[PDB]
Amino acid sequence: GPLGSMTQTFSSKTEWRVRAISAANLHLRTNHIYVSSDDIKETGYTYILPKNVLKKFICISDLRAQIAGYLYGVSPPDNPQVKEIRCIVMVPQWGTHQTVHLPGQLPQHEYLKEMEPLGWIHTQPNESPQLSPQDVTTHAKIMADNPSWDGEKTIIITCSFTPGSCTLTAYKLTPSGYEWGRQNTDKGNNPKGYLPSHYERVQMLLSDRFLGFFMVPAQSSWNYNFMGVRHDPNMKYELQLANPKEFYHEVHRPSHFLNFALL
C-alpha cells in the first residue's frame, strides 16, 4: 500500500529511438538478399532489378514503417520479354506496418519519359505466402487513376525483413484482382471478397551487370513519417536526379531537434 511508502517516477522511453538504433544496422542485410523462386514460372515478363538501388532502398528504410518506391525501366534492345528496372523514384510518403500512403500524382519528369512505369517496390516487416489485400487495393486504384499502368506489365515487389536478411518476391494483378481492388474500401486485413486468384507471381532476378539510379523530390525529402500532418493525398511535387536520404536523417525529423532545444 504505497500511498507514501514507495513512489517511483515515470521516465519516458520513446519508441522511435529503438527503431532508429535498429535502422542503423540495416546495411548488414544488404549482403543477404534472397529472391523467391516463382510458383508461376511463366508470366511473359522477367524483371531484372539492379542490386545497387535495391541495397540503397533497404538502407534508407525502417523495420516497422513501410516505405515504397516507384519502378521505371525498359526492355533490353532485342528482348521484349525482359524488363530491366533502371530507376526507383522516391516521392513524399508515410507508412505503417501494413501499407504505404503515396500522393495521387505519379512521377512526372522529362528524364523518365523514355522509360516505362513498371509498378512499385515496398518493404514489409514480415514475409507472407500471399500478396497483401492492402497491396492489391493500392495497385488497383493506381491503375484505375493512371492508364499508363498496364495490368500485364506492372508489378509489386515486396522486400520482407527475414531474420538477418531480406527476401524479395514479385507479383502482378489479374483482371479479377484489378476489378476487386479498385472498388475495395475496407482497409483491414480481411476485407470481403479478397481471393488469391487476384494476383500471380512473376519472375524476378537480381543483377550486378548494370546500375540503376534514384530520383527524389525537388523541394523536400521523401520521408514524411514524422511530419504526417504536412503530407496530403493531393500534394504535388517535382523531382530531381539525386540519391535519397536514409530514414532517420536529421531533415526527416526536425521536431526532435527543435523540441530538445526547447528543453
Binding site: 532508429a20 535502422a23 504536412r230
Partner: protein, 1724 residues
C-alpha cells in the same frame, strides 16, 4: 639488443605541478607558526633587499646602444635586473636563462633580446627588413598572450614592428604570419604549427625564441616546452642556422638543469636573482585548515577571510582570488553581508569621502547586476564572463584606489597589470574536467596571483595570504620560498611526442630517437637525480650516459605506437615507418589511444548515432565519470536527445555524448561540474571531429564524410542541420528566425521572392528588405560542366564555379573555403576531392577546375559533383553529371605488328661515307629501324614512326636525311623538336655526324631573327624549336628559303597534346599547306611516342597507312619492367618521407650494381634525397657501395666544385643535379655518372628533358610539384613521366630497363592506363587561335571568314573534332555540326582581333591586316601585348615610360614571383634610376621593370634573379622594336629615337648618361675617370692613341688589351653621305626622295660584341628623317649593313618654303655610333 619494456605509467609523477620532490623545507629567519581552532598559520616576514653588489649601478638608457634607445623611450634608467642583464642581452647572442621573482623585470630583459635581433636587420634607409626574421614569444596563458601583444606592440611601434597573436585555425589564416615579425603564442600553438612543417613555411625565419615562465616544465603542460626545445636545438644541428633561446623562470631549484636544457653557458647566460629582488617585499601568511568535514571547513574559510579583511578595511585594498566565475560574487556577498551584519561596512568608505560619490555615480551608470549590487559598498568582482568595458571600469576604479575589496579569478592575475597591497588566495582547490576531479591550483597560477601583492610605487610592503588545507602547507611554503624543484613530466607524453618527431621525419629510427631524447629536460633530470626517475645509482654507473635506459624508453614508446597503428616499428633494425593515422594524430594534437579507437570503429556504414558514440570514446575524456548527483539531470536530457544513445547512463561515454548534444542545442545545465565538463568536451570536439573528418575524407567514404563535416559545423555554429541557416548571421533576431522555422517551407524558396513576398510569407513586412539581403549574403555557387572524354575509361572534367552571392567582408572575411567532392552513382565513394578557396579579390569571377575520373562500360547513369562550404551549415550545391549523352571515343586500332626481320647491317646503306657514321658504334640497327629502313631510305613518302622513347627513332629521321643528301646536292632539311634542351643535344650529335664527318652545314636556330634567316640559307640541317620556326615560316611567301625545304622532320610530335602543343600543330599544318601550294612536295617525317590515335596524326600529315608505323609500348627494344607503387599519405612532405626508404630498397632490389637515376619534385629535394640514400647505405649491413672509383681518382674532380655537400655525397658515390648548379658542376656530375664512377644521381623534375645520361633503373619519387605562383601542387604532365621513364634504357649495356614510380595511391590507376597502353593526344589549338589567325591575315592566306574555316580544315584539331566531339564541345559529328562549330570559332577570333584593332572587317565577311597586326605578326608578339602598347605609348613617353610599358607585356606575365625577395626588390627600387609609380611589389610586370633597371645598371644579383633576367632579355629586343615601329608610324620623333637608344642600352647593359667606354671589355669606373680627365671621352679616342699613353691610362693586363682591341676592331665605323634627289624642282605636296649611302670601312668580321647580352646579335640600323622642332618623324627605314648599302627615303612635301630637316643614323646594338646631319630643302 637486450631491450626491456617499461611501464611508463609507473614512472609518471601523478600530481603534475603539485609534485614535491624536496623532502624538507627551510623557512627564512623570523618565520613563526601559530595555532588556532581547526587551523594553523605560518607567517613569513618580508625579506630585505640585498646590499648593492660589487660594481652595480643602474644603467641609464643613454648608455644603451643607440638603436635600442627607442625601445626604452620614456624611461630614465634600467632597474637592477636589467642593468645586470643588458650586456648579455643586447651585446651577445648567448642563450640565456633568467630566474627572478615575479614582477622583477624579466620581460624587459626579453625586450632587450628582441631589440638585439631587430638591430640585426637595420636597412641603410633606417627602416627594418621586417621580412628577414621572425621572433617567437611563448607565454603559458592566453590572457598573458594578449597582454604581451599589446605592450610589446606599443614598445616597438617606432621600429615599424608588427606584434601579433596567432588567432584561430590557420587553414586559411596563415597569411598574417608573413606580416607579423613577433608572434606571441602558447606552447601548444607553436607545437602544433611546427608539427605540420611542410615547405612555404615561415618557421625557417625564426631567429629568437623566448620561453616565458619556463618553470611550466614542472606542469603537466611542461612536456610541450621540452618538445619545442628539443625540436629547435636539434633543428639547429641538421640545418646550421642558429636560433637564440631565452628562458624566463621563477626562482626554483634545478634552474641549472634548465640551463643545460637550453644550452645556456652557466658562466655567460645564467642569471639567478633570489626573492630579495622582488619589487615590493612580501609579508606572507599561510593558513592551513585541519577540519576534515566540508560544511565546518567552509564556514572556517569564510571566517578566516573576514577576519583578514578586517585587518585591512580603510587602510589597504584587498584583492581576493577564487577559482570560479560564480564563486567570485558569492564570496564578495559573503564578506559584504557579513560586514553589514557586524556594522563595519562604514570602515571601507569613510563618510563624505570623495570616492563614495564616484562609486554611487559609476554604479548607477553601469549595467552589470552583481556589480551594481556591490559597487556602492567598495566591493567589486572581475572575471571573463563579464563585458570588456565592465572589466575596464573595474580596473579603472581599483587603480584610482576607489574599490576596497575586489574578488576575482586567475585571468585577472595573468591578463591585467593590477597590483593590490593585500592579496588573499581563498582556498587552493579547483575543478579539473581533464582530471575529472578537484585538484590543487597549478604552481604558475599561485605564483602569479601572489606576485600581484604589493604595488610598485605606492607600497613599502605587500601582504600575501594563502588559505589551503593543512597538509598542503609544506607544498605552498616550498613553492613561494624558492624550494619547489622543477622536474620533468614528460614520461607520460613520450609516445605522442615521439610520434610527432617521426611524422616530421626528424626521427627515423630508435637511434635518432635516443639522440632526440638526449635534448629533453627529462634526460638532464635523469642524469642528475636518477633515483627520482626510477633509475638505481648502480644502473646509472653501468650506463653513465643513460644510453641503455633511453633505448628502453624509446622501445617501450615505439611499441605502444606500433600497437595502435600510428607507426610501423621494426624491432630488429629499429626503423620507424610513418603512417597516415600517425600523421593525423600529430597534426591534430590527438593522443595515440584516441586514433586507435577511431581506426577501430570508423566504418563507411556508420550512422550518426555511432559517430557520436565514437567521439565520446576519445581518450581525452578517459577521466570523466558520471557522478551520482548528476544522474537525474542527465536522465532528463538522455530521455530527449535527438541522436539516440545506445548505452546506459551508468557509462561515462553516454554522459559525454549527451553533453555534446546539449552544447549543440545550447542548453544550460545546473551542475557546476556538468557545465565545466561540457566545456572541456566541446573545446576538444573541434579538432577531434576535424581529425575524424580528414580520416574518412581521405578514405573516400562519401556518406560518413558528409555526416562528419556536418558535425564539425554544428559544433562550431552551435545549431543542428534541421534549423534555419539564417541563424548563422548572428545579427538577425533569434525570435524572427524561430518564426521562419515554424513556417515549414524550404529556405531555397526565398531565393526567387523579393522584399514583398518575403515580408509577407513570414507575416512580417518590416523585415522584407533585411532578410532579403541576408539570403543573398549566404554563400551560394552555381556549377556547370564540360565533359572531355580521354579514352573509353578515363574522363577529363572541366568544372566551372560561378559565385552567385553578394560578398561582404563583415560576413565572409577575405576568403571562403569549400570542398569539391566527385561521388559515384550511389553517393557512396568519393572518386575525387579537392579544396577550393574563393578569395575576396575573385568573389565575382568564374573559376575553372579540372580533374580526371574513371568511367566504365556500360556507362553508369551519372556521377555527382558536390561543392560544400567548409564552415557554413546548409551550404552546398550538387550538380548531377549525367552520361546519357556522353559520346565516347572509339576504341583504338591494334598496333603495327613488329615484323621478325633479319637485323639490318650498317652496310645496307650502300655508301661508305654514310656507313662511317655508325659502323663503329653497332653492327646492326634495332628491329624498328630495320622495319622502317626501306620506306625511309628508299622512298619519298611522308612517314610516321610511333614508338616508346628509347626505341631509336632519331636514327630513322637520319635515314631520311641521308636519302636527302643522295637525291639532292644542297638539299635542305628542317628538324623540329619541342624542347630547347633536346635541340641542343641533337645539334651536338648531328654537327658531328653531318658536318664533321660528311662536310655539310648543321645549324641551330637561336631565336634572333636575321641570324636564323642566314643559318637557314647556309645549312643543310636546320635544327629548331617550334616558335623559332613559326616566326620564320610565317613569312614563307616572301622567303624562298622556307618553301625550298626538301625534308621537314618533327620529333616528339605527341607533344602537340601538351601545353605548348598549338605552335607545333600550327607549323606542321603550315608545312603541309605550303607543300600543296608550291606543288613540289616537301617530305615530312614525324617521330612520336606510342599513340593510340596514331592514324589521325599520320592522316593529318599525309602519311600512307603503309608508311605509318604505329608501335605500342610492348615493342621497346630494351624491355621495360615497370612498377607503380601507391602511397596512401595525402600530405606531401609526409608522403615524401614515407618514400625515402623505399627508394633505397628499390635500388638494392632492382639495380644493386647498375646505374640509377632518381627524379625528385624540387631542387631542394635532390640533395635531401642524396643524403638520405647515403645514410641508409651506411646503416645497411648487407653493405652496398655506389662509388666505383677510389678517393684518389675523385679528388681532382672534387676540387672543380663549390658546393660542399655535393663534394661529400659524390665522395660516397651519389651525385645530384638541379637548376642551381653551374653548368660546369652539372657536366662534371654527368661525367662521373656516365663513366661509372658514381652509381646514383638524384635529379630534379625540371631537368628531365636536358639530361645527357641514361640509367639501368629510374625511380620517380612522387609525381607532383609545388607551383608557387598559384600556391598549389600540380601533377606531372604525362609527357614528362614518359620522358623520365625513357631514361631507363641502355641498349649497349643492359638486357632490360627498370623503373619504379612512387605516387599517391589515387594516381596509380591513371599511370597504369597511360603507361602500359599507348597515349591518346588531342589538339588545344582552339584555345590558342588569335596570334596565328592574325599572322595568316597579315600574310594574306586568310582574307575572309570562309578562308578561316578552310584554314582550320588543315589542322589536327579539325581531324580530332570528328573523332572526339565532346572533347571540343561538339554534340555531333554532322557536317553542319562542325561547320557551325568552326564558324563560331572563326567569329570569336576575328571579332577579338578586330576589337584589338589588329584587323579590319568589311561587310562582316572580308578581313584585312592593320598596322598593329602586322607589327604583332612580324615580331612574334602576342596581340594583347601590342594592343596595350598601342594604348600606352604616346608622343612624349621616354626611357622611363618605355621600360614601364615593355615590362607590362603578356610575354613576361609568367616570370617567377616569390615573395622571398619582396624587400630585396623593395630596396632594389631605391637603387634604381627611375622611381616607379605606386609600387606594388606583388606583380611580375613591375618585378621585370626592376630587373630591367638592374641590368641597365650592371647590378650583379642572385643566380635565380640572373636566369630570370636572361629570360626577360630573350624577349626585350622584339618588344622594343615593336615599340619603335608603333611610335614611328604615329610620327613621334623623340620617343622613337629613345626606344632605339633603349635597344642599344639593353644590348650593351648601360644607360644614356653612362660613358661610351663602359662598353669596352675590362673597364671600370676608375678607368673612365682616368680617361675623362686625360682627353678621352669616346671609344674613337682610344684607337687614336699611341700604345704607350693608351696602356698608361689603361692600367690593365695584356690579354685584356687584346679584348679591348677586338671590341674596337668590330665597333661600327660607318661613314654616311646623303643627297636630296632633285633639290631644285621641289613642290609642295609632291614627292621628296632622299638617298643615303652607307659605307663601312672594313668587312663585317662577325656579330655584335655584347658579353652581357645572352643571344648573339647582328647589327641593326635605322635611317630617320625628322623635324626635331616639331617632334615629327617623317621617314624611317631599317637595314642591315655589310660593306656598303644605299637606302631611299620617301616623304610628302610640306606646305611651301624652306624647311630644315635632320637625318639620323641610329644603331640598335651599340651606344655612341649614332650620326646626325641637318639639311635644308627649298619647296618652291
Amino acid at each position: 639488443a637486450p631491450r626491456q619494456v617499461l611501464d611508463l605509467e609507473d614512472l609518471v609523477f601523478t600530481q603534475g605541478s603539485h609534485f614535491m620532490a624536496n623532502k624538507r623545507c627551510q623557512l627564512p629567519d623570523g618565520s613563526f607558526r601559530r595555532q588556532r581552532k581547526g587551523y594553523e598559520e605560518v607567517h613569513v616576514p618580508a625579506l630585505k633587499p640585498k646590499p648593492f653588489g660589487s660594481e652595480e649601478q643602474l644603467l641609464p638608457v643613454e648608455k644603451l646602444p643607440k638603436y635600442a634607445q627607442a625601445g626604452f623611450e620614456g624611461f630614465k634608467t634600467l632597474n637592477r635586473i636589467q642593468s645586470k642583464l643588458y650586456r648579455a642581452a643586447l651585446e651577445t647572442d648567448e642563450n640565456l636563462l633568467l630566474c627572478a621573482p615575479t614582477g622583477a623585470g624579466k620581460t624587459n630583459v626579453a625586450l632587450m633580446c628582441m631589440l638585439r635581433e631587430i638591430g640585426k636587420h637595420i636597412n641603410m634607409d633606417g627602416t627594418i627588413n621586417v621580412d628577414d626574421f621572425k621572433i617567437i614569444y611563448i607565454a603559458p596563458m592566453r590572457s598573458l598572450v594578449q597582454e604581451m601583444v599589446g605592450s610589446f606592440g606599443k614598445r616597438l611601434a617606432t621600429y615599424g614592428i608588427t606584434v601579433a597573436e596567432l588567432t584561430g585555425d590557420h587553414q586559411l589564416c596563415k597569411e598574417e604570419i608573413s606580416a607579423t615579425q613577433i608572434i606571441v603564442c602558447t606552447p601548444e600553438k607553436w607545437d602544433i604549427i611546427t608539427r605540420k612543417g611542410g615547405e612555404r613555411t615561415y618557421t625557417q625565419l625564426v631567429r629568437l625564441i623566448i620561453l616565458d615562465e619556463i618553470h611550466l616544465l614542472h606542469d603537466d603542460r611542461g612536456p610541450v616546452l621540452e618538445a619545442l626545445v628539443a625540436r629547435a636545438i636539434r633543428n639547429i644541428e641538421m640545418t646550421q642556422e642558429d636560433v637564440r633561446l631565452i628562458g624566463l623562470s621563477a626562482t626554483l631549484p634545478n634552474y641549472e638543469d634548465v640551463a643545460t636544457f637550453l644550452r645556456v653557458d652557466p658562466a655567460k647566460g645564467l642569471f639567478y636573482f633570489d626573492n630579495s629582488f622582488r619589487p615590493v617585499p612580501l609579508e606572507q601568511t599561510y593558513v592551513g585548515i585541519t577540519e576534515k568535514k566540508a560544511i565546518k571547513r567552509f564556514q572556517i574559510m569564510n571566517e578566516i577571510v573576514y577576519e583578514k579583511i578586517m585587518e585591512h578595511a580603510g587602510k589597504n585594498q584587498v584583492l581576493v582570488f577564487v577559482h570560479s566565475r560564480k564563486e567570485t560574487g558569492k564570496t564578495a556577498r559573503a564578506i559584504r553581508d557579513m560586514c553589514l551584519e557586524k556594522d563595519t561596512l562604514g570602515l571601507f568608505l569613510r563618510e563624505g569621502s570623495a570616492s563614495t560619490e564616484v562609486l554611487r555615480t559609476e554604479a548607477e551608470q553601469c549595467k552589470n547586476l552583481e556589480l551594481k549590487d556591490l559597487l556602492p559598498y567598495g566591493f567589486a568582482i572581475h572575471h571573463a564572463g563579464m563585458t570588456r568595458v565592465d572589466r575596464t571600469l573595474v580596473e579603472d576604479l581599483f587603480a584610482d584606489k576607489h574599490i576596497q575589496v575586489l574578488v576575482s579569478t586567475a585571468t585577472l592575475a595573468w591578463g591585467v597589470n593590477l597590483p593590490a597591497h593585500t592579496v588573499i588566495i581563498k582556498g587552493t582547490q579547483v575543478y579539473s574536467p581533464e582530471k575529472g576531479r578537484w585538484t590543487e591550483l597549478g604552481a604558475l597560477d599561485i605564483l602569479q596571483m601572489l606576485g600581484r601583492a604589493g604595488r610598485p610605487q605606492y607600497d613599502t610592503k605587500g601582504e600575501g595570504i594563502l588559505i589551503t588545507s593543512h597538509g598542503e602547507l609544506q607544498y605552498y611554503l616550498s613553492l613561494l620560498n624558492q624550494q619547489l624543484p622543477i622536474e620533468s613530466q614528460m614520461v607520460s607524453k613520450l609516445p605522442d611526442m615521439l610520434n610527432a618527431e617521426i611524422v616530421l621525419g626528424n626521427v627515423q629510427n630508435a637511434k635518432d630517437a635516443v639522440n632526440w631524447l638526449g635534448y629533453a629536460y627529462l634526460y638532464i633530470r635523469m642524469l642528475r637525480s636518477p633515483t627520482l626517475y626510477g633509475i638505481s645509482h648502480d644502473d646509472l654507473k653501468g650506463d653513465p650516459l643513460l644510453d641503455q635506459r633511453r633505448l628502453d624508453l624509446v622501445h617501450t614508446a615505439a611499441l605502444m605506437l606500433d600497437k595502435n597503428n600510428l607507426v610501423k616499428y621494426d624491432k630488429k633494425t629499429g626503423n620507424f615507418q610513418v603512417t597516415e593515422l600517425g600523421r593525423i594524430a600529430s597534426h591534430y594534437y590527438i593522443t595515440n589511444d584516441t586514433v586507435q579507437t577511431y581506426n577501430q570503429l570508423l566504418k563507411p556504414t556508420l550512422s550518426e548515432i555511432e559517430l557520436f558514440r565514437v567521439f565520446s570514446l576519445s581518450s581525452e575524456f578517459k577521466n570523466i565519470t558520471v557522478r551520482e548527483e548528476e544522474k537525474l539531470e542527465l536522465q532528463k536530457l538522455l530521455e530527449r536527445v535527438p541522436i539516440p544513445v545506445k548505452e546506459s547512463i551508468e557509462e561515462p561515454s553516454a554522459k559525454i555524448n549527451v553533453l555534446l548534444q546539449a552544447f549543440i542545442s545550447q542548453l544550460k545545465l545546473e551542475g557546476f561540474a556538468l557545465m565545466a565538463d561540457m566545456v572541456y568536451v566541446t573545446q576538444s570536439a573541434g579538432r577531434l571531429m576535424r581529425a575524424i573528418f580528414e580520416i574518412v575524407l581521405n578514405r573516400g567514404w562519401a556518406q560518413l564524410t558528409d555526416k562528419t563535416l556536418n558535425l564539425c559545423k554544428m559544433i562550431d555554429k552551435r545549431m543542428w542541420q534541421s534549423m534555419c541557416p539564417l541563424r548563422q548571421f548572428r545579427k538577425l533576431p533569434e525570435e524572427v528566425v524561430k518564426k521562419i522555422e515554424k513556417k515549414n517551407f524550404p529556405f531555397e524558396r526565398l531565393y526567387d521572392l523579393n522584399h514583398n513576398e518575403i515580408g509577407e510569407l513570414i507575416r512580417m513586412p518590416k523585415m522584407g528588405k533585411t532578410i532579403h539581403k541576408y539570403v543573398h549574403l549566404f554563400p551560394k555557387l552555381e556549377l556547370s560542366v564540360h565533359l572531355q572524354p580521354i579514352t573509353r575509361s578515363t574522363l577529363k572534367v572541366e568544372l566551372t564555379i560561378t559565385p552567385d552571392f553578394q560578398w561582404d567582408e563583415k560576413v565572409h572575411g577575405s576568403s571562403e573555403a569549400f570542398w569539391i567532392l566527385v561521388e559515384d552513382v550511389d553517393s557512396e565513394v568519393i572518386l575525387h576531392h579537392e579544396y577550393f578557396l574563393l578569395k575576396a579579390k575573385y568573389a565575382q569571377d568564374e573559376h575553372l577546375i579540372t580533374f580526371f575520373v574513371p568511367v566504365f562500360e556500360p556507362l553508369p547513369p551519372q556521377y555527382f559533383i558536390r561543392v560544400v562550404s567548409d564552415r557554413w551549415l546548409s551550404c552546398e550545391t550538387q550538380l548531377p553529371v549525367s552520361f546519357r549523352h556522353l559520346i565516347l571515343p572509339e576504341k583504338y586500332p591494334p598496333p603495327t605488328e613488329l615484323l621478325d626481320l633479319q637485323p639490318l647491317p650498317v652496310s645496307a646503306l650502300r655508301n661508305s661515307a654514310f656507313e662511317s657514321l655508325y659502323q663503329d658504334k653497332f653492327p646492326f640497327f634495332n628491329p624498328i629501324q630495320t622495319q622502317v629502313f626501306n620506306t625511309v631510305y628508299n622512298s619519298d613518302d611522308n612517314v610516321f614512326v610511333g614508338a616508346p622513347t628509347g626505341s631509336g627513332k632519331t636514327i630513322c629521321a637520319e635515314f631520311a636525311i641521308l636519302r636527302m643528301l643522295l637525291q639532292s646536292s644542297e638539299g635542305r632539311c628542317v628538324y623540329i623538336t619541342p624542347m630547347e634542351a633536346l635541340a641542343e643535344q641533337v645539334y651536338m650529335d648531328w654537327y658531328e655526324k653531318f658536318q664533321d664527318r660528311l662536310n655539310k652545314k648543321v645549324v641551330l636556330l637561336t631565336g634572333e631573327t636575321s641570324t636564323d634567316l642566314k643559318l637557314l640559307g647556309k645549312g643543310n640541317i636546320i635544327i629548331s624549336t617550334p616558335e623559332k620556326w613559326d616566326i620564320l615560316s610565317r613569312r614563307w611567301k616572301q622567303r624562298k628559303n622556307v618553301q625550298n625545304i626538301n625534308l621537314f622532320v618533327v620529333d616528339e610530335v605527341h607533344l602537340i597534346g601538351g601545353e605548348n602543343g598549338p605552335v607545333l600543330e600550327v607549323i606542321c599544318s603550315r608545312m603541309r599547306y605550303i607543300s600543296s601550294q608550291i606543288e613540289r612536295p616537301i617530305r615530312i617525317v614525324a617521330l612520336s611516342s606510342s599513340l593510340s590515335n596514331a592514324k589521325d596524326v599520320a592522316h593529318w600529315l599525309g602519311c600512307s597507312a603503309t608508311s605509318t608505323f604505329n608501335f605500342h609500348p610492348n615493342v621497346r627494344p630494351v624491355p621495360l619492367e615497370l612498377h607503380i607503387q601507391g602511397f596512401n599519405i595525402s600530405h606531401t612532405q609526409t608522403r615524401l618521407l614515407s618514400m625515402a626508404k623505399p627508394v633505397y630498397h628499390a635500388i638494392t632490389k632492382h639495380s644493386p650494381k647498375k646505374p640509377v637515376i632518381v627524379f625528385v619534385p624540387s631542387r631542394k629535394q635532390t640533395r635531401l634525397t642524396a643524403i638520405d640514400i647515403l645514410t641508409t647505405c651506411a646503416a645497411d649491413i648487407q653493405r652496398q657501395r655506389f662509388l666505383h672509383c677510389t678517393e684518389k681518382d675523385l679528388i681532382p674532380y672534387l676540387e672543380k666544385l663549390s658546393d660542399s655537400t655535393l663534394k661529400e655525397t659524390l665522395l660516397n658515390g651519389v651525385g645530384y643535379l638541379h637548376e642551381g648548379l653551374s653548368p660546369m658542376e652539372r657536366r662534371l656530375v654527368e661525367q662521373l655518372f656516365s663513366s661509372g664512377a658514381i652509381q646514383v644521381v638524384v635529379a630534379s623534375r625540371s631537368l628531365c628533358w636536358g639530361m645527357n645520361v641514361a640509367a639501368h633503373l629510374v625511380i620517380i619519387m612522387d609525381t607532383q610539384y609545388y607551383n608557387g605562383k598559384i600556391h598549389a601542387y600540380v601533377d606531372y604532365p604525362i609527357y614528362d613521366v614518359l620522358q623520365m621513364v625513357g631514361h631507363a634504357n641502355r641498349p649497349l649495356q643492359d638486357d632490360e630497363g627498370r623503373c619504379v614510380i612512387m605516387c599517391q595511391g589515387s594516381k596509380k590507376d591513371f599511370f597504369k592506363k597511360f603507361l602500359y597502353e599507348p597515349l591518346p593526344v588531342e589538339s588545344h589549338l582552339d584555345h590558342c587561335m588569335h596570334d596565328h589567325f592574325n599572322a595568316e591575315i597579315v600574310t594574306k592566306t586568310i582574307e575572309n571568314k570562309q578562308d578561316a574555316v578552310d584554314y582550320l580544315t588543315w589542322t589536327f584539331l579539325y581531324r580530332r573534332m570528328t573523332q572526339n566531339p565532346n572533347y571540343y564541345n561538339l554534340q555531333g559529328i554532322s557536317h553542319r555540326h562542325l561547320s557551325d562549330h568552326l564558324s563560331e570559332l572563326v567569329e570569336q577570333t576575328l571579332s577579338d582581333l578586330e576589337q584589338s584593332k589588329c584587323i579590319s572587317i568589311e561587310d562582316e565577311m572580308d578581313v584585312a591586316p592593320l598596322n598593329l597586326g602586322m607589327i604583332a605578326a612580324y615580331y612574334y608578339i602576342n596581340y594583347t601585348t601590342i594592343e596595350l602598347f598601342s594604348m600606352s605609348l604616346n608622343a612624349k613617353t621616354k626611357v622611363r615610360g618605355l621600360i614601364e610599358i615593355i615590362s607590362n607585356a603578356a610575354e613576361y606575365e609568367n616570370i617567377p614571383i616569390r615573395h622571398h625577395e619582396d624587400n630585396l626588390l623593395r630596396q632594389l627600387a631605391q637603387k634604381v634610376p627611375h622611381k616607379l609609380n605606386n609600387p606594388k611589389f606583388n606583380d611580375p610586370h613591375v618585378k621585370t621593370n626592376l630587373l630591367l633597371q638592374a641590368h641597365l645598371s650592371r647590378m650583379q644579383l642572385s643566380a635565380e634573379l640572373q636566369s630570370d633576367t636572361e629570360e626577360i632579355l630573350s624577349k626585350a629586343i622584339r618588344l622594343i622594336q615593336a615599340c619603335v615601329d608603333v611610335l614611328s608610324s604615329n610620327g613621334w620623333l623623340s620617343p622613337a629615337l629613345a626606344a632605339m637608344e633603349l635597344a642599344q642600352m639593353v644590348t650593351q647593359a648601360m644607360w644614356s648618361k653612362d660613358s661610351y667606354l663602359k662598353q669596352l671589355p675590362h673597364f671600370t669606373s676608375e678607368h673612365i675617370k682616368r680617361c675623362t680627365d686625360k682627353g678621352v671621352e669616346s671609344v674613337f679616342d682610344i684607337m687614336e692613341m699611341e700604345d704607350e699613353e693608351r696602356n698608361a691610362l689603361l692600367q690593365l693586363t695584356d690579354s685584356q688589351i687584346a679584348d679591348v682591341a677586338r671590341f674596337c676592331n668590330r665597333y661600327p665605323n660607318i661613314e654616311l653621305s646623303y643627297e636630296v634627289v632633285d633639290k631644285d624642282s621641289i613642290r609642295s605636296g609632291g614627292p621628296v626622295v632622299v638617298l643615303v649611302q652607307l659605307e663601312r670601312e672594313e668587312e663585317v668580321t662577325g656579330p655584335v660584341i655584347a658579353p652581357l647580352f645572352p643571344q648573339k646579335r647582328e647589327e641593326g640600323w635605322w635611317v630617320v628623317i625628322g623635324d626635331a622642332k616639331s617632334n615629327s618623324l617623317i621617314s624611317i627605314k631599317r637595314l642591315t649593313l655589310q660593306q656598303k648599302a644605299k637606302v631611299k627615303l620617301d616623304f610628302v612635301a610640306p606646305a611651301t618654303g624652306a624647311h630644315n630637316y635632320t637625318l639620323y643614323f641610329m644603331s640598335d646594338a651599340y651606344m655612341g655610333c649614332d650620326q646626325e646631319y641637318k639639311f635644308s630643302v627649298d619647296v618652291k
